Amino acid sequence: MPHRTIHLFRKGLRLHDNPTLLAALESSETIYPVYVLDRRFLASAMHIGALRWHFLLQSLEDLHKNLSRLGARLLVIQGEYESVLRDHVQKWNITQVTLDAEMEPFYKEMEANIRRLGAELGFEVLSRVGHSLYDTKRILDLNGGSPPLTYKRFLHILSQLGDPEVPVRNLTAEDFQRCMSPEPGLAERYRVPVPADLEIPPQSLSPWTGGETEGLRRLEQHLTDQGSTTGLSPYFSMGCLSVRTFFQRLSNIYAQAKHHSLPPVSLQGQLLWREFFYTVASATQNFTQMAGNPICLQIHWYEDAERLHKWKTAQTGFPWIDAIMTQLRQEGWIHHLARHAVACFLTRGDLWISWEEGMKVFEELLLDADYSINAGNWMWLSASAFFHHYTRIFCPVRFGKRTDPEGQYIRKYLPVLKNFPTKYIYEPWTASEEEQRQAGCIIGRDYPFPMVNHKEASDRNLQLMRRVREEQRGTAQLTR
């Protein structure tokens, strides 16, 4: 097998169900498994917070360990990807570069530039899809060339298409005996960087740890506990876990239960929601912004950086909202309906700030930040597309009360409020100043007053949204 190959990890930080890396190994006599850490590229394409950096480095550490157990290695190269390739195609006499066929525009542009470099330097480029359950193009073709714009229509097209693609086999020590992974000269240059190399605090405090190994453990620990959700989203978004592998595992449980257990089928539905947004995002221009986006309602959101700042820094004065944003910032993950609460509050519900700004904050702070899922759900929660019950607005006081009447979640993440009686824990501004003194927390000093009046703001915003939907009837109809 002739090729000397670089495989470029970008997502796909796993060895199970990795069709591109498998294709690389089957076609090559020597291989260099590489992650290019390109700060200039990421600076131009992404917003990445400290917790996300920690999860990436942990996932790279684990990938290095798993490759090393098979007689190989991970090579982390720090630089601009074009210069890195010019240098290392020469150093390693490369004839093939492999990389996953990611759908993100910034990844597609990188891929286009790498293909152009291959035409110049003399390497072929091979890609396989490792991020989706289905061949997205097949879904588009069955729907006449355009993506389904409702989940119902999406499911109808999938029922014509059939089952998802199956995972490919695991990689083995024999693969790296047939296709050798040489230790390069100057190998200390290729170590996984440590947090201080990225100027981030050294200790990661997220209850999440990156990597394929922890992803697989968590997956199996969830199914055993089932005998709160999976908490697997960061592993799917980073590629530490294959959605095809998880889909098939759920099918295995359904089969062994003689088709009598529907909970695994419900969880398969969560991955179909992921696939829905990936499919729309892959075939919709300007998907992650409002202007020029053909399915997005055009809404003149306020430019009010101070409102955004208060929301982002958990200083809205609504404890339920600030507690969620605090868990997001400190841990990097929040429950689906917690995301509903704060996204509705920021956009159509209260602050009337663009969903694009909420998306960018979530991108920075979420371990599971995902181009397609995040944009799709932010359009949903702002009632810009997909969701149309705009007279229904989450109450930033009452919603948590049903869940957690005593406010234990609030007291955990906002300990300044920990001594407030539950009668005030969701609306501490209604306490008298003397009750505030007794709780040790003066509103406006230790914890802010509420930044809007929810009743007045949501009333305002309902009238604004109604004008939008009465005028842009055709746009709203696209996703209903």
Ligand X SMILES: Cc1cc2nc3c(=O)[nH]c(=O)nc-3n(C[C@H](O)[C@H](O)[C@H](O)COP(=O)(O)OP(=O)(O)OC[C@H]3O[C@@H](n4cnc5c(N)ncnc54)[C@H](O)[C@@H]3O)c2cc1C
Residue 399 touching ligand X (CB under 6 A): no
Whether 249 has a binding-site annotation, put simply, is no
Residue 341 touching ligand X (CB under 6 A): no
Residue 143 touching ligand X (CB under 6 A): no
Whether 369 has a binding-site annotation, put simply, is yes
- Please choose, from the candidates 411, 396, 399, the residue with its C-alpha nearest in 3D space to the C-alpha of residue 317: 396
Residue 271 touching ligand X (CB under 6 A): yes
Shortest reach from residue 141's CB to ligand X, in Å: 23
| Phi, psi torsion values for 220, nearest 5 degrees | -70, -35
Specify the residue, 114 or 381, whose C-beta has the smaller distance to ligand X.
381
Residue 369 touching ligand X (CB under 6 A): yes
Count of residues touching ligand X (by CB under 6 A): 26
Whether 261 has a binding-site annotation, put simply, is no
Distance CA 280, CA 46 (A): 20
Residue 336 touching ligand X (CB under 6 A): yes
Residue 133 touching ligand X (CB under 6 A): no
Q: Pick from 5, 270, 436, 479 the residue near ligand X by CB under 6 A.
A: 270
User: What is the helix (H) or strand (E) element at residue 424, kind and residue range?
Assistant: helix 422-425
Q: Which of residues 2-41 bind ligand X (CB under 6 A)?
A: none
Whether 403 has a binding-site annotation, put simply, is no
Whether 277 has a binding-site annotation, put simply, is yes
What contacts 24+ positions apart, CB below 8 Å, involve 123-126?
A: 123/89, 123/94, 123/95, 123/96, 123/97, 124/3, 124/95, 124/96, 124/97, 125/96, 125/97, 125/98, 125/99, 126/20, 126/23, 126/24, 126/27, 126/96, 126/97, 126/98
Distance CA 450, CA 88 (A): 56
Distance CA 79, CA 87 (A): 11
Specify the residue, 264 or 450, whose C-beta has the smaller distance to ligand X.
264
Distance CA 333, CA 231 (A): 8
Distance CA 366, CA 234 (A): 8
Distance CA 150, CA 447 (A): 42
Q: Which of residues 176-235 bind ligand X (CB under 6 A)?
A: 229-233
**Stretches 66-74, 213-221, 323-331, 335-343: which one binds ligand X (CB under 6 A)?**
335-343
Specify the residue, 184 or 231, whose C-beta has the smaller distance to ligand X.
231
List CB contacts of 97: < 8 A, sequence separation 6 or more.
5, 6, 7, 8, 85, 89, 114, 118, 123, 124, 125, 126
Residue 279 touching ligand X (CB under 6 A): no
Q: Pick from 343, 395, 425, 451 the residue near ligand X by CB under 6 A.
A: 343
Shortest reach from residue 221's CB to ligand X, in Å: 13
**Stretches 18-26, 38-46, 137-145, 273-281: which one binds ligand X (CB under 6 A)?**
273-281
Specify the residue, 236 or 301, whose C-beta has the smaller distance to ligand X.
236
Q: Pick from 154, 176, 236, 247 the residue near ligand X by CB under 6 A.
A: 236
- Please choose, from the candidates 192, 205, 239, the residue with its C-alpha nearest in 3D space to the C-alpha of residue 49: 205
Whether 163 has a binding-site annotation, put simply, is no
Q: How far is CA 165 from CA 134, 235, 471, in A?
A: 6, 19, 42
Residue 345 touching ligand X (CB under 6 A): no
Whether 86 has a binding-site annotation, put simply, is no
Residue 362 touching ligand X (CB under 6 A): yes
Residue 373 touching ligand X (CB under 6 A): yes
Instruction: Kindly state the tokens that stand for 43.
Output: 């600076």
Residue 354 touching ligand X (CB under 6 A): no
Token pair 């969830």 in the structure block, residue: 222
- Please choose, from the candidates 161, 102, 56, 150, the residue with its C-alpha nearest in 3D space to the C-alpha of residue 387: 150
Token pair 């590629």 in the structure block, residue: 239
Q: How far is CA 130 from CA 96, 99, 144, 216, 236, in A?
A: 19, 10, 24, 17, 11
Distance CA 18, CA 167 (A): 8
Whether 37 has a binding-site annotation, put simply, is no
Whether 333 has a binding-site annotation, put simply, is yes
Q: Pick from 14, 218, 339, 348 the residue near ligand X by CB under 6 A.
A: 339
Specify the residue, 300 or 336, whose C-beta has the smaller distance to ligand X.
336
Instruction: Taking the CA atoms of 148, 152, 153 and 156 in sequence, report the sign of the dihedral they define.
Output: positive
Residue 377 touching ligand X (CB under 6 A): yes
Residue 340 touching ligand X (CB under 6 A): yes
Specify the residue, 23 or 369, whose C-beta has the smaller distance to ligand X.
369
List CB contacts of 113: < 8 A, sequence separation 6 or more.
81, 82
Q: Mark the binding-site residues for FAD, compressed into ranges.
A: 229-233, 270-277, 333, 336, 368-370, 377
Binding site for ligand X (CB under 6 A): 229-233, 236-237, 270-271, 273-274, 277, 336, 339-340, 343, 362, 366, 368-370, 373-374, 377-378, 381
Binding-site members are 229-233, 270-277, 333, 336, 368-370, 377
